[PDB]
Amino acid sequence: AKNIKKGPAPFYPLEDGTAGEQLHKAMKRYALVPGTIAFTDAHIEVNITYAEYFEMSVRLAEAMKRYGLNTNHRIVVCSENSLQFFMPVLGALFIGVAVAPANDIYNERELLNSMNISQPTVVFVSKKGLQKILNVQKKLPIIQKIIIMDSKTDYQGFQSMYTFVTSHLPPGFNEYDFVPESFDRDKTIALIMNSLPKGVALPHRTACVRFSHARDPIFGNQIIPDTAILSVVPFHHGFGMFTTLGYLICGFRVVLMYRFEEELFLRSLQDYKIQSALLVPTLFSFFAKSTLIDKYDLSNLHEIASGGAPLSKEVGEAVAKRFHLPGIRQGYGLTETTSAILITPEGDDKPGAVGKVVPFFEAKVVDLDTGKTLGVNQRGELCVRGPMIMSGYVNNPEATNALIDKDGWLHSGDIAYWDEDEHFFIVDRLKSLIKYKGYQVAPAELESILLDAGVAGLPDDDAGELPAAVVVLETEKEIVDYVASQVTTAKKLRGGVVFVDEVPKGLTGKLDARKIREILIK
Ligand SMILES: Nc1ncnc2c1ncn2[C@@H]1O[C@H](COS(=O)(=O)NC(=O)c2csc(-c3nc4ccc(O)cc4s3)n2)[C@@H](O)[C@H]1O
Secondary structure (H helix, E strand, C coil), X not given: CCCCEECCCCCCCCCXXXXXXXXXXXXXXXXXXXXXXXXXXXXXXXXXXXXXXXXXXXXXXXXXXXXXXXXXXEEEEECCCCCCCHHHHHHHHXXXXXXXXXXXCCCHHHHHHHHHHHCCCEEXXXXXXXXXXXXXXXXXXXXXXXXXXXXXXXXXXXXXXXXXXXXHCCCCXXXXXXXXXXXXXXXXXXXXXXXXXXXXXXXXXXXXXXXXXXXXXXXXXXXXXXXXXXXCCCCCCHHHHHHHHHHHHHCCEEEECCCCCHHHXXXXXHHXXXXXXXXXXXXXXXXXXXXXXXXXXXCCCCEEEEECCCCCHHHHHHHHHHCXXXXXXXXXXXXXXXXXXXXXXXXXXXXXXXXXXXXXXXEEEECXXXXXXXXXXXXXXXXXXXXCCCCEECCCHHHHHCCECCCCCEEEEEEEEECCCCCEEEEEEHHHCEEECCEEECXXXXXXXXXXXXXXXXXXXXXXXXXXXXXXXXXXXHHHHHHCCCCCCCCCCCCCEEECCCCCCCCCCCCCCCHHHHHHCC
16 A cells, blocks of 8 residues: 555664663763753743753762662652753663653542552652652552652752762762663663553653654754753653653753743743744633734744644634744654654645654554555544554553554554645544434534534434533523534534533643533533
8 A cells, every 4th residue: 555654764863872872972962062051941030051951860860870770660750840850851761760750730549550550669759749649659669769859958858859869979970971871772661651541661762763853854853053942741741751852852942831821931932032832732722812922022933833632723823823933833642652753844834734654654544443544535543653652551461452453553543534745634532523323523623613612422312422512601502503503414513512611621732522521411
């Protein structure tokens, strides 16, 4: 088949060594370049240079190494976005310790599940998540040491990263003579991300491939001095984990925000002369008729990238017009494929599309019932294969086999198609789709008519399901008759409106057709 969309050759080549070796290199170079900033906290106007950041990470790597951390070990990083977030991350990659990010805002049972799977020996937590760790550490004797990420001194009894380094580093330790560990790239896990979620094991190799897309001037961002990115996405999530690590490879300035504010964001875009802004589709609400935008100097802004959830083509084009960009750059990925494997290639837009198959990958679309590869414009389940695909779910080989087949194809459970130009469009998640009779109804299409809103299906005994909605006012039958008179016959709101304070969305933009399913049933 040429019914398989393949990715082109990389405009930037894969590189040798492990991911920590590749990163130690990049960052040591920048450390030696005075004044280059790794991270900026827009909330407290604080910078931390590549010189400082490299020194503390190397310092903390060696300190973990002397503590007895190695390839048999996992550590968890449990934190809101911060200047301190990537210190333990980087530190461990340099010496081959597995890093398991734990969701900042997980409840206790979710946080217990996560760590139960990841089995951490040392836990890194912000001050904000400490009591959550303590409350569940009871059930997890694997944890022997707890360290506070964002404190200089000890904190309520626990060593901080700084005081920990002090006890385990020899004085007059030179950070520029530290050499990271070499080991098997495909065999040594770098990260364990969560999806009840499962631990996604990602070998060093998958981050090394990512480091090719990151520097690829067509699929990523060409290394160019004094480049500043403004990232809003969470670091414990694949979206933020692998975009950010790619930025440090490029030596970019990552201006982070621990919570989106309308004014702060627009402030920092101008102030920090920012070239690229990393958002999630939910934050496009605020830039509908955002009056503010017109005040600022957003002349430096070259692009705005979205991911992690669908962006309506309408609001995508609107927002882009407001920033005078050609359009919204876009990337599609799953936790299980490391980072984005569909990316809007520079110099090749297509509204609605999530992009084209990145280098090293192949994407295809299959029949739900027979698995046959489907052709152009034919909708079926999206399948991808390439070297960023996880090695497995940690300690759950069954679920690894249910997802990745013999030939290496990952089954995304997203319905999607490609066109004559090999651009890929994502309809919806398969389980998010409504089956009114035999006829299929896609939430995304109904919601753009309404626009807040969320569309799911009432399990009608008659039709199977009936296209329903939740509505956040800016009445009902004055809308169902508006719905029915916008769509066609099977897409009429055969399940009505149920007004709500707020539409159930996950931290990266996705809705919740399971919670919304339950919610409408009242
Ligand atoms: N761009 C998109 N458009 C529409 N839907 C999207 C989507 N991305 C994820 N999704 C949906 O969320 C699911 C994925 O959720 S997930 O498991 O938590 N993982 C992710 O969402 C995930 C893991 S890595 C990553 C991204 N990396 C990027 C790098 C550069 C860039 O410009 C944009 C992006 S997005 N996203 C998908 O299965 C799909 O349903």
